Design a protein around this ligand. Sequence first.
Ligand SMILES: [F-]
Ligand SMILES: [F-]
Ligand SMILES: [F-]
Ligand SMILES: [F-]
Ligand code: NI
Ligand code: NI
Ligand code: NI
Ligand code: NI
Lengths: 100, 100, 100, 570, 570, 122
Amino acid sequence: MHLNPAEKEKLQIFLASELLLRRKARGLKLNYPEAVAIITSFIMEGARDGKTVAMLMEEGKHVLTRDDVMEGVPEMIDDIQAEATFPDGTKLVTVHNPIS
Amino acid sequence: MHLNPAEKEKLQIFLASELLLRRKARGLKLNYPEAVAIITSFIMEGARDGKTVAMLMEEGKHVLTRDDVMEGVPEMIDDIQAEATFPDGTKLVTVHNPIS
Amino acid sequence: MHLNPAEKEKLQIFLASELLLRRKARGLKLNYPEAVAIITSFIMEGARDGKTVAMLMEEGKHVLTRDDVMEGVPEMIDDIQAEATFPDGTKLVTVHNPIS
Amino acid sequence: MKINRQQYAESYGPTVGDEVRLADTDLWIEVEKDYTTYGDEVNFGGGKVLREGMGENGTYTRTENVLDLLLTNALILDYTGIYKADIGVKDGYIVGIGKGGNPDIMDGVTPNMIVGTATEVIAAEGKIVTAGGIDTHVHFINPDQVDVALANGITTLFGGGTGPAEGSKATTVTPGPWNIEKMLKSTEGLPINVGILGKGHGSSIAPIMEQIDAGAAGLKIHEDWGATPASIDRSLTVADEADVQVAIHSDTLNEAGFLEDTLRAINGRVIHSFHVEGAGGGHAPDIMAMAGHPNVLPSSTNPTRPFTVNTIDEHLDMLMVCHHLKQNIPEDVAFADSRIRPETIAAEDILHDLGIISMMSTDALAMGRAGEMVLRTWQTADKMKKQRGPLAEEKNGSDNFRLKRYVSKYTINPAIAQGIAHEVGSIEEGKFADLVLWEPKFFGVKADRVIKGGIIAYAQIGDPSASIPTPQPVMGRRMYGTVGDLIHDTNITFMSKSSIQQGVPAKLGLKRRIGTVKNCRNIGKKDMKWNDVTTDIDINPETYEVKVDGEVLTCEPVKELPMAQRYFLF
Amino acid sequence: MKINRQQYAESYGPTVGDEVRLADTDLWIEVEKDYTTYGDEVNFGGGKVLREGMGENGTYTRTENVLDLLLTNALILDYTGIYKADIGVKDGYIVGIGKGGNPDIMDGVTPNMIVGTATEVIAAEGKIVTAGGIDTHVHFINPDQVDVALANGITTLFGGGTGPAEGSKATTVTPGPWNIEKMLKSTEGLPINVGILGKGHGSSIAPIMEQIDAGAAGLKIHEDWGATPASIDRSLTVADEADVQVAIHSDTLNEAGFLEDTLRAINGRVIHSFHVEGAGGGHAPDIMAMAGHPNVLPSSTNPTRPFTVNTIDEHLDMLMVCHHLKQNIPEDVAFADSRIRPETIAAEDILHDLGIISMMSTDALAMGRAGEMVLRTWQTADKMKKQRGPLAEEKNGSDNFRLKRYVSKYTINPAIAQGIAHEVGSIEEGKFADLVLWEPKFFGVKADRVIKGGIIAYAQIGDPSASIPTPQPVMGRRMYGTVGDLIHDTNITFMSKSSIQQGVPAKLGLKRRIGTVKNCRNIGKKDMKWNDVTTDIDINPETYEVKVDGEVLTCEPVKELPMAQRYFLF
Amino acid sequence: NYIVPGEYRVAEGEIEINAGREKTTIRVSNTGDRPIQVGSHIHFVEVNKELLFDRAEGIGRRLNIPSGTAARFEPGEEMEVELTELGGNREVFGISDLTNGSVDNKELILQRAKELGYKGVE
Ligand SMILES: [F-]
Ligand SMILES: [F-]
Ligand SMILES: [F-]
Ligand SMILES: [F-]
Ligand code: NI
Ligand code: NI
Ligand code: NI
Ligand code: NI
C-alpha cells in the first residue's frame, strides 16, 4: 500500500466518523469529538470525490445542525481544518463555524 | 477532536467488533478475540447510550451464545471488563461468564 | 483480546479496505493503495473463511478489474502478498498480477 | 483439614500427579514433583501469606538470603523437568528453585529464598513458566520484529543483518567490522538479548577473523555468498580458534560439491546446520541427511513446521517470489521442484519426534516467522501425538517425555549450540532470569508476561487509563524493563571472547550486560538435550523418500492445527 | 551472446540511452553513461555474482580497498549527471562511484570498490537513487514531522523551533543560548540530520552572537520579531564573522521600509531569501524581485508549488486562519489580498523553470508541508513541461536538463546555501552516504529505502511477523539506523565553527556526528547549480504583473497534478 | 498515451556481453545422481567433481551467460556450454582451492584437480 505517516493517522478519522455516524443513526445527539470526526471525514472524502476547496468550505457548514449535537457543541467548534489529496494535490480546507 | 490515549486505543476495539460482526454475518463461528471484541464494544456503546453499569452487567451475558462461537471459547472467557464514559463519568463494567 | 503486533497492524488493512469499498460504491475509480487494500483484505478474510492458499491465489485475480481502477494502477501492482491464519496456521498467499 | 484436588489446583495451581492441557492441543503435562509444604504455600494479597512477620521475614537485609523477586507456585516446563516450585530471582539471575517464604514460621523454606522487605512478588499459581525462547536464526531486517518475537515468548535473538538490505534479507549476516560495530550500537535499543553473526566467507583467514575481533558472536556460511569448500573451511578454522559457532546454509545448487563434499570440508568439526530439511536452503535434495551426523547440531526453521495441506503450495510460491524466479524459465521451475519436497517435509515432522532434529528456529523475515517458533513447536508435537501415538517412553496418561523433547528444541539446545547456555536457555539456578509466564489456555500462543533479567519486559495487559489493568483492550505492550536505561540491565549482548578481551564494549560505549560466547567447539549431537540421536539418514535422489533404520519416514499433512483460528484475529 | 535491451533493463536496470518515466508524470530521464562492463554486472543472491572467489573477493581485509556497502546497478539522478553506476560506501561516506566487484576476475573494477567479506549489498537495479533532500526551512513544532520528511526522501532538516510555542509556530527560530542547548540535546533523538537557527534580531551584536557560540548553525530574520534595518544589519555582521548563513522573511507590511530598504540594509552581503514569491511572507507585493540579485540565494516554500486551481482559495483562507485575521477588519482583508497573488504565484512556476529561483524547501507546519518538498518539485517540473514544452537545452527526447535543474533545488543548492555541501547534498565521492532509493513508479512520491550514514534509517516495508518482508501492510517504518546508539553515528548535527571550537558538543554530551558549517559568506547566486540566473525582475505595484527581459511571466493554474490521487489514501 | 507509472522506454539495439573475450564451447556431463547448477562467475575448472569435461578447458574461464544466471545439469545430463575468459587480474582464490593464484598455472591446477578426484583431468 506504501502508507505514509499521515495516511495511517487519517484512517483513524474515518473510523471515528463511522463510529459517530452509527451513534447518530441510533438517535444520539453527538458530542464534540463525534461532530468533529464526522465533518472532518466529510471533507476528506469530498476531496477524494474531486470537489473543490471552495465547495467544501460551503458544504461543511451543512453536514450537522445544532439539533444533531449536544448543548454547547456548536459553540465549542470555531472551525474544522483538514488536509487531503485533491486532484491537484494536497490542500487545506477550513470550515468556519460549521454548526450554527 | 483532542483524542487522548484511551480514545485512540478504544477505536481499535470498535473496529475489531465491526470485523467480527461481519464474520458472524457471513455464517462463521466466532473465535476468542472476535467474541471479546463484540462484547467489549457492546459495553462501550451501551455506556454511550446512557445505560447503567448494572444494566450492562446483565445485558453482556446475552450478546453471544455458545452456538455463536467455536468450541471452547465460552470456557476461555471468564469475564470481560471495559471502561467507558457514562453520563456520570468513566465507570468499569465487568461481565461475568458472558457466554454460557 | 490478547492482540499481538500483527493483529493490531492488520486491523488497519481491513479498515482501509472498508474505506476503499465505500469509495468504489459511490462510483469512484480506485487508486493504488485502495486497490491493494481491497485485495489484501479479501485474502485475509478468505483465510478466515477456511479457503485454501490455492483458492485464494486464483480468486485474488478476480476481485478488481481494470475498469474498477485508475489508469496505470493495474500495471503498478505486480503482486499482492498477505499472511493470515488458515485452519492449518499462518500461510502466505501471493496473488500475481491481480488486475489485468 | 483436607482440601480436594480440584479446589487445591484452583487456588495454588496443580500439584503432583495433576495434568494440564497445553492450549487447545491434545497434549497433557503432568506435575512430576512439588517443592511446597502443604499448608505453607506462598501467596500474596490482602490477608494472604506474604506479609511482615508471617510469610514475609521482617528481619533480614537484602544481602542476607532475601530475594529481589519471588514467582509463587510456578508450574515449570523445562528440559530438567515438569514440576511445581517457587522461583527466586536476585541480581537479575535465578538463585533458587524450591520453596520461598519465611523460615521464622514456615517449614521447608529453601535457605536463600527468603521473602523480605526487598522482595517483589509475581503470582505464578495456575501459570506454566518456561525459559525464554532462544532463536538462533534471526535476520535483522525490520526492528518491529522484536515485539513480534517477545509476544510468542522469545527472549534471545541470534543472527545477522543491517536492516532491509538485500544481503540481510537473504542471509543472517552482519558483514565486516564496521557493520558489526554499527549493529552492536543499534542493539543498545532492542529490548531482547542479541548475538550477531559475521560473514562466514573468504579464502584468507584475516577478513573472516576480524569480524570476530570486532564483536561478532559467530559466523554464518550462506550459499548466497558462496558456500564453497574454501569458505566452509576458513570459517571453521576461525571458529575453532575463536570458540564461536558457525551456522551453515549449504550449496543447494550442488555447484561446487554435493553434500558429501560439504561434509568433507567440515572435516568432523562442529557446525550448526540451519533449516536442515532444506526447503529453507541446502544441497538438493539430500541436505537433511546432515542431521544424522555426530558433529552436526541440526535445526529446523518454522514455515515447514508442521506438514500441512497448504505448506507446499505456499512454499513453492514463497520460493518463487523471494528468489524472483520466473515460471517461464525451466531451470527455475526445476529448481523449485527440487527444493520444496513433501517427502522431506513429512519426514522432518518425524525426525523431530524421534529426537534426530534437535532445534527449532524462526528464519525471521527471510523464509520464517518471527513470532511462531514456540507456536509451531507445539503444533508439531500435537500432530505427532495424533499420528504416531504417545511415545513409548511415556508414563501412562501424560505427554511429559514428548513435552521435554520439544521444549528443549527452542530453549536449551539452541543455547548450547551457540555457546550461551551458561547464561540462558533453561530454568536453572545460576542462569539469567529470562522467564515466560503462560496461561495454559494460551500456552505457546500468546505469552502473559515476559521477564527479562528479572524485570517484566513485555506483557499482555489492558487499558492504561483504567482503574485496574485488565479492562480492554488487552494487547502486548512493552513494560518498564524496556524503558530508559533499564533496557541495559535487563538484556545481554553476546560477544566473542576476543572482542571482550580487546575492549570492544568500552570502545563502542555499550551499556548492556555483556555475555561471553564459549564452549562451542567441544560439543556435538550427543549434547543436545532429549534430541541426541545419530543415525544414517538415507534420502533417495530419485524419489526423495527418507529412510532411517531401513524404514521409510512418511506421514500425512493435516488440514487443521490447534493454536490457530481459535486464537488469532487474522 | 547478446541480450535485447528490454531484457537487459529488466535484469540490471536501464543502460545508456534508455529512458525512464518519473512516476506518473510526463518527465523522462535518459541514462547518459554507464560505468559497468557488460557481462560483469554485480548482483547478489543465490547463484549470483557476488560470491566468494567470484564477484566477491575472499582475500582482502576491510582496510584493503574493501567496501562496507555496495549499492549495485543504481540509476543516479543528481546535479552531476543522470547515469548508471555502482555506489560504494565505507565508514558512512560515499567512497566510490563506478564499478564494484572483484579485480581477481572482473574487468573494469574501480580500485577501492572491492566487494569483500566486509561488504553488505543493496540491490539498486531498477531503482533511481538520489541524494537525500536538504530542507532548509523547517519549523520544529511536532516531532512526528520527522517521519513525514523521511517518507518523502528528506534527510536534513535546517530551521528552528522549540515545539508548538507561538514563536516557533511562526518562525524558524530557536532563541538564545538555553533554548539552543535544549534543542541540541533533543536532536540526539531525532533520526535525521539537523541544524538549528537562532533569532536574527537585535540592535547589539552580543545577544545575537551568543546564539552562534551556543551551537546555532545560522540565523533567521523574521518579520514577526521585527525584520527591521537594524536586525538585518546586525545579523549579517554576525554571520560574516561566524561564517554561517542568514535566512530572511522580510517586512511584508513595509513598516520600516520597502524592498529597496531591506536590500540597502543587506548591503551586498550574502543572504538566503525564504519563500521568495511572498505568499509565505515578505515585502508586499514585490519581494520576489529579490531572486534577481547576485547576493541572494532564493528559495520557495512548497504550498504555492505549483500553481493550481485550489491554490488561491486555499491560501487566502490559510493566511486568515493562521494569522487569526477577521473578515470584518478591512485592513486584514486588504493585507490578505496584497499577500496572496495569482500573478506572482504563476510567475514563480516560470522562475523555477528558468533557473531564477534556486531552491525548494517545506516551511514545515508554518505554511508548508513537511513531506512534500520533493513531491512538489517534480509536479512543478511536469507542469512546466506541459505548458512551456521541453527546454531548449534538451537533447532530443529526454528531460535531463530540466531534471538536473529541478533535482538541484532540493539537494545540492540548499546544502551550498547553508555551508554544508562538503558533507551532504549530492551523490559524490567524499560525501556522507545519505541516499534515497526510489522505485520509478513511486519516484518523488514515496521513498523505498532511506540510507543515512550508510545504514538504512527508513523503509517502506511490510508485515514484521511474515515469512518475508513484502506482505501487507507495507508502510513507512523506522529501521535499525534509528535504534539505540546507532542514531548517533547515522546522523549529523551541524554547528557553527565557534561552538565546535568552544567544545559545546562535549559540554552538552552530544554523541551525534558533528558537522561544521563553513564557506557561507563567499558564495552567491552564481554558485547555485543549474539555477544561477541573475536578472532584473520587475513587479508592477498596481497589477502585480511580473516581467523579466520585458516579457510578462504568466501561466495558467492546472486542475490536476500527477503524483496525487493515484498514490494517496487520503 | 496511456501512462504506466515508472515505465521504461529502452533504446534500440542489443547488449553484447563479455565483448572481445575468447569464447570456447565444451561438452559437460553430470555423472552424479543429483542436479548441479552452475553460476555465471565460478571459475569453471572448480565446479563439482562429478561434472565430467576436459578440465583443462575450464581453466581461466567461466560461463558465457548473462551475469547472475546459471546453467543447470540434471542427473545424467550431458550438454554443450559456451565459456568466456576470466578478466581482471586473472587470478582465482578459494572456491575449491584448486587455483589460489594465477590461472596461468595450468599444471598445478590440474595436478590438484586430479589428486582430489575432479573428473576429466586428461
Ligand atoms: F536462507
Ligand atoms: F535461512
Ligand atoms: F513565516
Ligand atoms: F516561513
Ligand atoms: Ni538459509
Ligand atoms: Ni535465513
Ligand atoms: Ni516565513
Ligand atoms: Ni517559515
